[PDB]
């Protein structure tokens, strides 16, 4: 029984970054040779587990964190990095194991006029602990003055939209991501 | 109640065909507890016999993981969740296969939970549960296993026929 990587790497629609999905994989015979040796994945680079010897070790549980982020912005899905994603949406530990593929998807995600369904947090108070999503969208007051929970001056809705279009550049096209974690 | 017997021999945790083994066994004429559903301790192993399930664990609470076996009319389900059941959180391993005098031996060694059923108890199945197990309850005769040396007479097709304490 080969566990379903095809249900994570071929899902019809991916989940925006601020509420990144997750799937637990256990009790399967998983092959990473099919994953590594494909020319589609425009990124594959990982840590403490070299890609050649992936399938010759077995762990207790393997996780899969999937989302969709800006093309340029994908450099922050890595330990030790800091920015918007790594500091407010998806933060990795320092001793990370498992690894991260990211293939362009502009033919699938973006549509003419815009695709607003992918959102990302923009304002917060404190940096995220690793592997800690938050969904609450209480208005962020930009200063000491409160605003009684209304979008206005010095108070903003913390979720703003990517809005892809196919005519954008590679620096702004949508790059689906998957982040395998190992026991 | 109390009773005595002559049985409790299973294949010595090893699947060789063919002998003397120093394993966890049940003394031949030992004190076995005739029952007519308390929470009995597990010790190192139990002999179970009756003429439809089991719950194993340490605290049998949500603080620790607990083993649960249930036999349907068509199917057996083995799950190890943090049972209270009232609430199921975590839920790690789940085993589903055909349902199990009916006599059983349960031992939990090296993170594996081994089952033998039917003397010469053939191995039913072993499970990579990987939890501590100290006390148990029946969802019958209950004995306890002892680490003593045995002599087992194989009968030209395996089939342990006679045994010697």
């Amino acid at each position, epitope marked *: 029984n080969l566990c379903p990587f095809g249900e994570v790497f071929n899902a019809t629609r991916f989940a925006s970054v601020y509420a990144w999905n997750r799937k637990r994989i256990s009790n399967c015979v998983a092959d990473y040779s099919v994953l590594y040796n494909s020319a589609s994945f425009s990124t594959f680079k990982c840590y403490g587990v070299s890609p050649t010897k992936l399938n010759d070790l077995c762990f207790t549980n393997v996780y899969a964190d999937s989302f969709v982020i800006r093309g340029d912005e994908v450099r922050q899905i890595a330990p030790g990095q800091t920015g918007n994603i790594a500091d407010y949406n998806y933060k990795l530990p320092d001793d990370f194991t498992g690894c991260v593929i990211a293939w362009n998807s502009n033919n699938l995600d973006s549509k003419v006029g815009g695709n607003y369904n992918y959102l990302y947090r923009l304002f917060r108070k404190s940096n995220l602990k690793p592997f800690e999503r938050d*969904i609450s969208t209480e208005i962020y007051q930009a200063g000491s003055t409160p605003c009684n929970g209304v*979008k206005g001056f010095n108070c903003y809705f913390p979720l703003q*939209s990517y809005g892809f279009q196919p005519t954008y550049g590679v620096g702004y096209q949508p790059y689906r991501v998957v982040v395998l974690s190992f026991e | 109640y109390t009773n005595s017997f002559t049985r409790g021999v299973y294949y010595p945790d090893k699947v060789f065909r063919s002998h003397s083994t120093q394993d966890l066994f049940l003394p031949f004429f030992s004190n076995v507890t005739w029952f007519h559903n308390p929470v009995l301790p597990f010790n190192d192993g139990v002999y179970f016999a009756s003429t439809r399930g089991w719950i194993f664990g340490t605290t049998l609470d949500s603080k620790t993981q607990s083993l649960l076996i249930v036999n349907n009319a068509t199917n057996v389900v083995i799950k190890v969740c943090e049972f209270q059941y009232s609430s*199921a959180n975590n839920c790690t391993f789940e085993y589903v296969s055909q349902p199990f005098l009916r006599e059983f031996v349960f031992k939990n060694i090296d993170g594996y939970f081994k089952i033998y059923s039917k003397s010469a108890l053939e191995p039913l199945v072993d499970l990579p549960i990987g939890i501590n197990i100290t006390r148990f309850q029946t969802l019958y005769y209950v004995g306890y296993l002892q680490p003593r040396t045995f002599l087992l007479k194989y009968n030209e097709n395996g089939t342990i026929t006679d045994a010697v304490d």
Partner: antibody
Amino acid sequence: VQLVESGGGLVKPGGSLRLSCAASGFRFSDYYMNWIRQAPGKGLEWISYIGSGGFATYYGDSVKGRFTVSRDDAENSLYLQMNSLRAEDTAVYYCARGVTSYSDNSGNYRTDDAFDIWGQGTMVTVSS
Amino acid sequence: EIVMTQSPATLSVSPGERATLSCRASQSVSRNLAWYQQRPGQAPRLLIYGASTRATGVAARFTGSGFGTEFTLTISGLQSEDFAVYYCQEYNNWPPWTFGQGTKVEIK
């Protein structure tokens, strides 16, 4: 956990009407919301959809240009705007809610979009 | 445009029996389907989402299964309340979501 709707009534062909439903008992600003509808004695049909804070509007095939949906998160309220009405869209409009996230027993942080707790009906009859 | 068809016309089962329902999709959605029970005169109610998970206020006598294109729902031990119409709707994309045509369970 309480969706109460209002604004339903009788309209003439070619008019307009504005339905609304107010919710209480949860954080309203974190959930998808969207409007189902049911013709009299037929199967349910899906009509609108709003996202997590505007800028996500979608619509059905037969109501593409006539219906405007918008939500005011702070008031725990929701509105649907109906323009250039016709006669064969008489129905009983509901305002559902989608389970945005379902964290299962282990991991499985899956994002669903099924219509959990609904409202009552608001009969909307269109005739001359 | 994923056309869903259920097509048991009118299920006719006596109380206390274990009945099954069918919802066949034209394409692959593979985990995205829901089951609704709509008692006559009431608003509908969610039973299954994800094709296997039960809702909050549902008894264990409702079970559903399927993957890809064939989905089923099984009701065991009917009571008087459980004679209604049943729908299935698919949501494995953004744009229009289609509701199944609905089947009714009667008393025999």
